[PDB]
Amino acid sequence: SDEVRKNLMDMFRDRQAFSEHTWKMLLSVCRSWAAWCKLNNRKWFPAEPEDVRDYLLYLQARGLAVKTIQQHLGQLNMLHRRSGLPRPSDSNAVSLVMRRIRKENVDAGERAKQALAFERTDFDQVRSLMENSDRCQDIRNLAFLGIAYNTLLKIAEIARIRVKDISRTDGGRMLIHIGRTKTLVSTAGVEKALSLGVTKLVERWISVSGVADDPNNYLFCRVRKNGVAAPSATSQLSTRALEGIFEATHRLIYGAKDDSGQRYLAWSGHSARVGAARDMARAGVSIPEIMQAGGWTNVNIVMNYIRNLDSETGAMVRLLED
Template sequence: MTELLPAAGLTLADEILLAERLNEFVQDREAFSDNTWKQLLSVMRTGSRWASEHGRSFLPMSRADLRDYLLWLQASGRASSTVSTHAALISMLHRNAGLVPPNISPLVFRAVKKINRTAVISGERAGQAIPFRIGDLLRLDAQWSGSGRLQQVRDLAFLHVAYATLLRVSELGRLRVRDISRTADGRIVLDVAWTKTIVMTGGLIKALSDLSSQRLTEWITLSGLIAEPDAFLFGPVHRSNRATVALLNPLSTRALEDIFARAWREAGPGKDARPNKNRYRGWSGHSTRVGAAIDMALKKYSTAQIMQEGTWKKPETVMRYIRHVDAHAGAMVDLMDKYASS
């Protein structure tokens, strides 16, 4: 078992050992998702800047300094979920550096509890992407199917796959033409190598409906990608109305998010949708996951089934998405309605 270094008072030998462990940590960065690594680097930049400005130490960080840092984040307007992310990633950094995580202190535990309680009492609510529902998909399908614009053909196929598979944007971007196979009746099956929560050699299989299979087939046929098995499934479309065969780099997150923005302009509810947390003002990369989860809940699929389709590990995540579904049909509402009608 690796011996943990103290949170303060490091000797020269300790500092050398710390540098070695951090170097090993960086060398093994592939053990973490790109998003986790980007978040960690962002936290390190923010935390280091705070420590420098306030005469504190970021690594190692004492329990008192971490408490003050988290309270400073809240005072600076960060959401409680963001503060919790900073605390968790600082703990992860300390563990991988062989340091005692300051988060284990009751001082930090009370600070986090205080931050969460204050946030809830002050009216903070978790933001949620505007759902992209099955009705939205079919409305777009009626408007974009048969389009002479290759970009719309691609966008429609992408939205079909996004809704049908509940994959995350980054996971959709990694799909390649070779990941397509077909069932006996011609429907498409996608072989997803790995997801944020499922990393194993067996991968994940996602089947498409007849309509979604048809739209994806139209895209790879018209774009010519059907003859390019190593190309990313959803690549760029040049303004000359020709597809670019992308072999090295997938479409950026920004480019994929732009697909949702174009869909919103074409078929979104517009002013009828209320933005929340100044962030969700139209469909975004998470909208198909939220919308599909809501549609499944409305059709009485179980939470376990929804979790399986969306590769969610925690039922709390799914419940946050579908919390308004059948809210009027709770046990107490049912009980009181029965007494009122008797």
């Protein structure tokens, strides 16, 4: 009763031990669960297993994805395990219904989607059009698109780059040192090399933006309606803005989005990462090489961007046709 209160207090004291995103989703799931509980006159904490089971079934009935449901269940489990209490998933009712919901949704066809690919051809076509612009906005966007495709870095890692993180090979190729993440949080860190063509795009951006003024400045920054860049060493370009560059570039080439409300109708923050991964594979690049490129530690995730690369090769259709 008080041991629980202490545990929770300890968790909140050292908040910084978890990503802000985890907290954000913890409160969002708690909001959702607490509302369902109120609407059903139930106690939201500690959670009763039969109540949690009803809630997950309610989420499925609302039409949410299987991964969304697993997230709600996962946030509830963390809140309890860290409170010193037993996890809802510790009961049959909850573990069995989750399995049953995954089964029925997947059987009805549900599948986890992945970002619309932005590949070598898309990059070449965008560079060919934007190459000739003098606008600060255009120069920045093209430089961002290039780094994204060349390095396979997530949008959050890109927004984190500082001018001082950039070095250069003896060959004149740019090098961006990256230190952590989801994960990777390490010592040492990594370096991402840019092709000569791409480092040229970045050079042009630094020049017109004037972010080199201070090595602490973040590489990318906002650019106001009048074309003036606003370098900063305290704030970074929101990842929401970066997803906006991918979306506006797609609209530039293909026009306005659908109306279906569906996701991935245009390029998004993860598009170049899935597009590059796939280009390397279709080129014969070895798995360890492809892995190094994306930072993937296992051969599973990799196979996953290629997870949607399965298409009739015609292999058997050739053996037979001869």
